[PDB]
Amino acid sequence: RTMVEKSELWVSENYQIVKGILERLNKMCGVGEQMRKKQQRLLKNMDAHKVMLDLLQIPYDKGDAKMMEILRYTHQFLQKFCAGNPGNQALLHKHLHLFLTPGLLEAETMQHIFLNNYQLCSEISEPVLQHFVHLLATHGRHVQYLDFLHTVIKAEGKYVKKCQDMIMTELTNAGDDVVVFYNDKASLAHLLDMMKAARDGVEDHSPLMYHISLVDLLAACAEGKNVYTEIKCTSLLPLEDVVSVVTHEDCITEVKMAYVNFVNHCYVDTEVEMKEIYTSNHIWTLFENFTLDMARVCSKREKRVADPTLEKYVLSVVLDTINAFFSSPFSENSTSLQTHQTIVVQLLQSTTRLLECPWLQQQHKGSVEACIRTLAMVAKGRAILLPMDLDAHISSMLS
Amino acid sequence: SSFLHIGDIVSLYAEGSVNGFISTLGLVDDRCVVEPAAGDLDNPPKKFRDCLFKVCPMNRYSAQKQYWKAKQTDVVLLQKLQHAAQMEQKQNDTENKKVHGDVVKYGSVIQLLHMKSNKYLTVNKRLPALLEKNAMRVTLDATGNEGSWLFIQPFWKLRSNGDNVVVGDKVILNPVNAGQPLHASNYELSDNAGCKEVNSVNCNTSWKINLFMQFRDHLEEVLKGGDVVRLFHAEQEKFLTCDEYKGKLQVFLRTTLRQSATSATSSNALWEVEVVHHDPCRGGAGHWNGLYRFKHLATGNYLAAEENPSIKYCLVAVPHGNDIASLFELDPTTLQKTDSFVPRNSYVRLRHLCTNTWIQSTNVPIDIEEERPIRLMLGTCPTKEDKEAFAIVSVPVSEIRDLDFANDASSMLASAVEKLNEGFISQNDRRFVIQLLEDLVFFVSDVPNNGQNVLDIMVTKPNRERQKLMREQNILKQVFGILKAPFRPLVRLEELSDQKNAPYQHMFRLCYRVLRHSQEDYRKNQEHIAKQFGMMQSQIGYDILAEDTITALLHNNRKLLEKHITKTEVETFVSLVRKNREPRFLD
Amino acid sequence: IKYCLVAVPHGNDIASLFELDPTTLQKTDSFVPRNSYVRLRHLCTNTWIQSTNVPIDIEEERPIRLMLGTCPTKEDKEAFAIVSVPVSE
Amino acid sequence: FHAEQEKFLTCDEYKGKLQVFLRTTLRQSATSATSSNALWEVEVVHHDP
Amino acid sequence: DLMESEEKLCIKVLRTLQQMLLKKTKYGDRGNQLRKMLLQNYLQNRDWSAIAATQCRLDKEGATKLVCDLITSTKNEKIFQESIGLAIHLLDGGNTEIQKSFHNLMMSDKKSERFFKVLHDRMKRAQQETKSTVEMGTSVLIMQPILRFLQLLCENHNRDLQNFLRCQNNKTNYNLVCETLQFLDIMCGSTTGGLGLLGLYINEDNVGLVIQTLETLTEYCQGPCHENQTCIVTHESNGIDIITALILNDISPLCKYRMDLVLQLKDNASKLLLALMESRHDSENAERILISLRPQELVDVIKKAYLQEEERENSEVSPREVGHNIYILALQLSRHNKQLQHLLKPV
Ligand SMILES: O=P(O)(O)O[C@@H]1[C@H](O)[C@H](O)[C@@H](OP(=O)(O)O)[C@H](OP(=O)(O)O)[C@H]1O
Ligand SMILES: O=P(O)(O)O[C@@H]1[C@H](O)[C@H](O)[C@@H](OP(=O)(O)O)[C@H](OP(=O)(O)O)[C@H]1O
DSSP states (O other): OHHHHTOTTTOOHHHHHHHHHHHHHHHHHOOTTHHHHHHHHHHHHTTHHHHHHHHHTSOOOSOOSSHHHHHHHHHHHHHHHSTTOHHHHHHHHTTGGGGOSSOSHHHHHHHHHTTTOHHHHTTOOHHHHHHHHHIIIIIOOOHHHHHHHHHHHEETTEEOHHHHHHHHHHHTTSBTTTBOOOOSHHHHHHHHHHHHTTTTOOOTTSHHHHHHHHHHHHHHHTTTOOSHHHHHHHHHSOHHHHHHHHHOSSOOHHHHHHHHHHIIIIIISOSSOOHHHHSSSSHHHHHHHHHHHHHHHHHHHHTTOOOHHHHHHHHHHHHHHHHHHHSSTTTTTOTTTTTOOHHHHHHHHHHHHHHHSTTOOHHHHHHHHHHHHHHHHHHHHHTOOOOHHHHHHHHHHHO | OOBOBTTOEEEEEEESSSEEEEEESOSSOOOEEEOTTTOOSSSOOSOGGGSOEEEEOOOOOHHHHHHHHHHHOOHHHHHHHHHHHHHHHHHHHHHHHHTTTOBOBTTOEEEEEETTTTEEEEEEEEEEOSSOSSSEEEEEESSOOGGGOEEEEESSTTSOTTSBOBTTOEEEEEETTTOSOEEEEEEEOSSSTTOEEEEEOOOOOOEEEEEEEOTTTOOTTBOBTTEEEEEEETTTTEEEEEEESSSSEEEEEOOOOSSSSTTOOOGGGOEEEEEOOSSTTOOOBOBSSSOEEEEETTTOOEEEEEEOOOOOEEEEEESOSOSGGGOEEEEESSOOSTTOBOBTTOEEEEEETTTTEEEEEEEEESOTTSSSOOOEEEEEESSOOSSOOEEEEEOOHHHHHHHHHHHHHHHHHHHHHHHHHHTOOOHHHHHHHHHHHHHHHHHHHTOOOSSOOTTSOOOSSOOHHHHHHHHHTTHHHHHHHHHHTTTOOOOOSGGGGSGGGHHHHHHHHHHHHHHHHHHTTOHHHHHHHHTTHHHHHHTTTSSSSHHHHHHHHHTTOHHHHHHHOOHHHHHHHHHHHHHHOOHHHHO | OOEEOOOOSOSOSGGGOEEEEESSOOSTTOOOOTTOEEEEEETTTTEEEEEEEEESOTTSSSOOOEEEEEESSOOSSOOEEOOOOOSOO | OBTTTTBOEEEEESSSSEEEEEOOOOSSSSTTOOOGGGOOOOOOOOSOO | OGGGTOHHHHHHHHHHHHHHHSOOOOOHHHHHHHHHHHHHHHOOOOOHHHHHHHHHHHHHHTHHHHHHHHHHHOOOHHHHHHHHHHHHHHHTTOOHHHHHHHHHHHHHOTTHHHHHHHHHHHHHHHHHHHHHHOOOOHHHHHHHHHHHHHHHHTTTTOHHHHHHHHOOSSSSOOOHHHHHHHHHHHHTTHHHIIIIIHHHHOOHHHHHHHHHHHHHHHHHHTTTOHHHHHHHHTOTTOHHHHHHHHHHSOOHHHHHHOOHHHHHHHHHHHHHHHHHTSSOOSSHHHHHHHHHSOHHHHHHHHHHHHHTGGGGTTOSSOHHHHHHHHHHHHHHHHTTOHHHHHHHSOO
């Protein structure tokens, strides 16, 4: 604090001490979970936050390459000052204006301030969201801003309807700079080209990561049975492009999971009827691809190998999508479901075979069982032919 | 040297990274660019009408901004907001009229209004510039908003805040909201060659204010440089026209069968009057003593006199007006007030300065080969005839703006047609095409855009001028091209119902609505559209609103029905009903 | 930089003559107002004054003398203000 | 006073000859940098000496 | 002297002076016991009139000069607020001696220009903040005590102090009446509010500030001071339009849940309008008010107010009393407007 009050000298001797002090403070600030709470309370009592914030306000030159590292530690300290401490988040939320500056390091601290704090996320003022959206539009396309936008939507499990609606209203306004999508043939080819270099894994901060985060945010903001955001987001990403990008042979699990989540929360789980989903032969190709993925996962496990991303994709989003499609008020009508019956039997047999495998952990076995149950109810109403062995195996668990 | 005043017409010449005049690409396009190769201070650009701005006082947009916000996201509240916006607009108009002529001082707030497009220059901090990312976009908005406010700050230390601005002084234009001075960047537009983007970003650019017209001289009761006028021969009751006869441009008098000669108004008959001045960038009100030049608005050529091939001299069009031959002088046909300003709608006699010969109209036609020649020759003769006088009839600025908008729309529509023919169209290009189609629908309908559905618009009385503009400027041809090219692989009529093709369906419906609106109460447009009856028939049976257009075209038109229905049309109807067995075709 | 501003012993020579050009609008060529910006032009050479950034005392550690010269062209930026000094000073 | 350069015209002996130049001042306000060497006298040319 | 360094000490001294001027307060049985014990230990040996006597005593000590100097030379918001509060307390009750001391200090002091400049800058900052926001900002909050202080400064119909506030004998003259009028005009939404949307802008949060501003305007106008009435009526901001709209229009949102505040606001607006023409024989003010104030709307408002007496429940102002005040205003306006006079006649 004394040095910060007189920062003109260093803004050589007054740099090493600063970096050492910051490194020590960051190192001893957090240990385990209870020592972390004790240190947080102790630092709050002696007002370390005011000192740390004051050091951030020092007028500095655009390019130093030495003092910048100091700010690379200061912010980190503030990140550990609020971990699981809503009081600390409220304390530094009063001075939030200091963090409304272009940059990437400040974005992480801003995200951590609003992390798992419903009282703040639900009361976030419009200027913060506008600032972040305009930074995304003008400054550039970065994943930190998308992460901040995402964390504020869902806090403590509950979804913030106001933020969900406003983020949609302001994101769709800017196009080709913020909401970048690859729907055209040339754009699809470019997307495939960039993806092909990520077969071994999606590089962090790459444009593919930005696209995945954007799709995830778009799906999440409509995860409230909303009628305004759901219809608004349907035009930007049509079902045709979703199916085309999900059914491609050279497709990684991340984009497939993102698209399946989008078509589950924005298309299937909806408050109003969508013509394309039911009165079109689009979701059935997705179901065929789901069966193919199930068979591929079974074969991979049989080969004493496994891909955790593929396991998560096949056990989290596909099952939820299948359950939602076959467990909706508009699906029991089966105006077009009568024409297609073989796909239902294929899905049922694939799901029951997946259950038959012993490696299925108990936590996610309930979703598979629920999918089988829903398919059984659909089959009973639809009067679809059932194989003898499959029928007996299903009836073993029906009652 | 004179002080800058509110209402003066001036042109800005950037002299920073790139030196040149600031202009706009077109009326339909909101981008503003600088073209260094177009011209300089010594030699102003040929299309100087596109580089003229007017200084206007500060305006209030708070109530309008609230109304727009309400529209973006109760009925009584919306009506109250609309009324408040109307009162705010009236108050702004009254204040602007009141502050007319006041001197502009450094550090004050001014607005720049583009004369050709009647749109305020605006800076949007939220949206970055297209070519330059770190900079802020600059565009043109017809209504305007708080982004149009600018500070005319000094560029020379010898000038200080609070001092009167003097014509010819270099200044800095700092937007009030964005806060970053305008900059003529070096980024070059891909579509347009030689044009550099203008964007809001920190720089050292200096804007030189060149005065084109004073606030006092800006009145509609006097002839002024840059004015658009028509030359009417009272004795022959014909309008001067310039057109390509076989392969060369010729100037003639056209023959009209209309009962009223004055009613025979055409775009080719428009001319622009340029007052000869020592300063190339200065116009102003003209004088009887002062010399004049006439420029063809459509082609850009200048009227001149050349040796007669065989009536000693011939009136013709030349590419460059810098030549002394283009000079002309006016002689009053009646008494004048001490050689005062030339009054509007005043009969005059044109004489060639170089040859000292007076214009005259000859009865020898130029198109004898044609069945009904309509082009009459002109020439300069030494003698002066009082009967041979040309009246200069003024054209309203609104008509010129409408013509420019029609030309720009036709150009962009032809570009879109070429893109569709190539087989690939970008999403942004398709959105621009749809927006232009909606704008054209509103243009022909002559109904203000108040959020009403474009596909559902009814007109109490059609505007004949707008329909004639649409037919003459080839907008209908481009509309037919758009209706033909996609269907003729890229898109299929049967697949139009697909959601992926929904924008295409909207575009086709907009085109058909434009066709329906254009032909209402107009024989020539009705025949021109009916010439594509086969194409219109081929598209029947799909949700493209073609049936409504066909019904409107063939409704209560006996002569049109007789002429434009043949055996092939009935055969097509029979084939369609056979293919579908649809009773609607029997109806 | 065709010519250099310098000091000469005798002012009777025609070279010492200079003329003032207003930097702003003036009242019918009335008296020169006090504290008024002006541009100086050499009558004999018909050249306008201008300030160059080339110093005269490069040898010094911190040069402070900047050179001046007359050039044929006229620059509106290059204007010298005549600030009056009180008689008491 | 040169507004563009914010410097006062001065005349001084550099090495052995008088030279006219613009002086550089470190003061915050250029106008405040007033020196005796910067004083000039204006003589109006008249027919009567 | 100590404000330059010991700012906290100056604030404490000002608060102690304010407490001394304030009336006695009860602090409970334990508090009373402690107070009595301490008074006996230390002070072993020993009504508006008492407050006025204490105010005169402090003025003799130089409290008015102290507050004026602090306000003029203070760069800290807390010190300025404390000085304004102390000045309000000194002027509490409209004491003539305190007003005369204030006037003499302003006239004799050489920094009166600086004092009014500080007040005017605070007022402009408050209006700018109100425009920007349209909770309460610090400027809009500090404006309330300033308005209260000015009202007490001009209380009891003091011609000299009202004239001094309107104009000063200094090189730079700051008009506080027009600043208050502009503040009220901006709070109400300006032309948008005056066009029938005033209800949206007015809320229970700013209703108190609006009422205080209206009361201050009435205090300025009454006496009657023709100059203040002319300035307010003919001001370019057209705040009289807002004043007329207040009476003519009903604030739908605030009135829906809270009607007593509406009644007080309408009563204050009617009193202000009556004060605008207390003794004005000339008719230009009447015509200006009639331009905004339509005859038929005025008589309809009066008739509604008379039949609105049922709203008096849980109200400190009778709707019929406000109707009677508006009726008196309409009677005064009638002579100029024939239609208003004809309408006001009974069946
Ligand atoms: O009276 P109608 O049947 O409407 O026909 C009009 C007129 O009689 C001429 O045919 C033509 O003028 P010109 O021969 O002089 O071109 C005009 O075209 P326009 O609309 O292009 O003026 C027509 O509209
Ligand atoms: O701020 P300080 O410490 O008083 O120093 C003054 C100023 O900063 C310069 O050193 C000098 O001006 P120049 O370099 O332009 O001579 C001036 O001399 P002066 O008093 O002779 O103007 C000093 O008085």
